[PDB]
Subunit: 115 residues, 4 copies
Amino acid sequence: CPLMVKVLDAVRGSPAINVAMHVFRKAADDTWEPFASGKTSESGELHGLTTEEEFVEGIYKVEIDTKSYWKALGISPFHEHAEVVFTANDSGPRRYTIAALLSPYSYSTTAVVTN
Amino acid sequence: CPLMVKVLDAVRGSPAINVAMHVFRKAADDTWEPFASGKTSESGELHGLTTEEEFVEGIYKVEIDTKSYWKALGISPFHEHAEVVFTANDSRYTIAALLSPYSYSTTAVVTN
Amino acid sequence: CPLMVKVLDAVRGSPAINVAMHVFRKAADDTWEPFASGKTSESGELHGLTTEEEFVEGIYKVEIDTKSYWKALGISPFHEHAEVVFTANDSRYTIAALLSPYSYSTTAVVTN
Amino acid sequence: CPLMVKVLDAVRGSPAINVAMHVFRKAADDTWEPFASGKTSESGELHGLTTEEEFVEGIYKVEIDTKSYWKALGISPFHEHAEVVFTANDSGPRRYTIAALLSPYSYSTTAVVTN
Ligand SMILES: CC(C)=CCc1c(O)cc2oc3cc(O)c(O)c(CC=C(C)C)c3c(=O)c2c1O
Ligand SMILES: CC(C)=CCc1c(O)cc2oc3cc(O)c(O)c(CC=C(C)C)c3c(=O)c2c1O
Ligand SMILES: [Br-]
Ligand SMILES: [Br-]
Ligand SMILES: [Br-]
Ligand SMILES: [Br-]
Ligand SMILES: [Br-]
Ligand SMILES: [Br-]
Ligand SMILES: [Br-]
Ligand SMILES: [Br-]
Ligand SMILES: [Br-]
Ligand SMILES: [Br-]
Ligand SMILES: [Br-]
Ligand SMILES: [Br-]
């Protein structure tokens, strides 16, 4: 699994479950092409977005739909979504875990990159 | 000042100086229209982006060029940029960002 | 002002006002000696803790009473307090803390 | 496993490996008694600190030795250690994951509490 995303809720001290996210890849013409999407599980994780063959070098954007998450819980948050934009696989295949920790007016995101 | 941005460096324990950013406003067709831009000062702050009359309700995106900042310090970072996307709602916005090479956080303080 | 503390609330998007804190200095026997204390202002800041002459090199601990802050807002938090423990080194310190009920971050900006 | 700690390095985009930590429990006389200790693995995790029987209600302090970690890498960081202080098990047994994300002048910590 070359790209995985983990999302945590800093208000409840829990995984952020059923969080939707859309991944885009920058095309040759500089537009964002849809690449993969899904929603987090009960553990706050999203696995299986892509495969090593399909996840070629490029610039990727993970848009995590945090507003929808907080609204579904009756909280009115600040951000529309959390956006994570990065070059992937530019020195060969790597495995990426993107983590995001969510509060209504703040988030943090980190990446762990392994070879 | 309706909109201010402050950027800090978590590796050096310092303001993040000369960080470029662009602000965009979402247009009716869902594209991003340039709105304002600038570079942070010696105190890590960028003031004067817009005025109360111009800063109407809408979706805005602040794109902080973190990759250039880390590159000028000779450090390889993860992200291309940091993005802060939000609705401005009439019901002062300070956007803060704390940068590390493989992580960042952002918060908003909305005050009177 | 050699030492300033700023505390923000990540749930409300606001300064964290009336947050109490105590500062301690590590003594030669490894106990913590009271050094300074106060409560954050309307802007989430606590100024005036110490002076340059008193703030000598040493290990200090800032204990931020986050549990009382969340309790007064009617919210159950995780931590008893946030602790920031550091060496002051002569080779201005701003300690920031961003609070959520089950998380916090802290950073130091050390400037001239 | 009722108490686990995960530590990440925000400069390298990696788990924080071989990070030492000491856990204390507040005694009846208000002193901190040593409770458990260990160091993170190659995945940045520390498992097996305690058992459900021994991990009774109380106030616990996890002191993560971040300065030693950064020094061992030739970085001079700001903090002595990261301290996580919390009441545990006060409405019955729970399982706690403490996470910490480390930079030389900043850290974040979060807790996930499950039942
Ligand atoms: C693939 C590997 C060795 C670690 C990747 C990884 C993980 O497998 C679990 C994780 O859980 C976490 C749980 C938390 O409560 C937490 O705060 C983090 C840190 C992420 C932040 C502060 C955005 C992480 C975190 O980054 C994290 C994380 O980076
Ligand atoms: C002395 C100087 C050049 C900056 C010190 C300073 C400050 O004067 C105001 C600040 O407001 C902030 C407002 C925020 O919403 C915010 O998230 C931060 C970042 C600190 C964290 C995430 C613990 C800061 C922050 O670090 C900060 C900060 O470090
Ligand atoms: Br979408
Ligand atoms: Br599931
Ligand atoms: Br949007
Ligand atoms: Br891009
Ligand atoms: Br921030
Ligand atoms: Br602020
Ligand atoms: Br305590
Ligand atoms: Br120790
Ligand atoms: Br191991
Ligand atoms: Br110490
Ligand atoms: Br964390
Ligand atoms: Br977790």
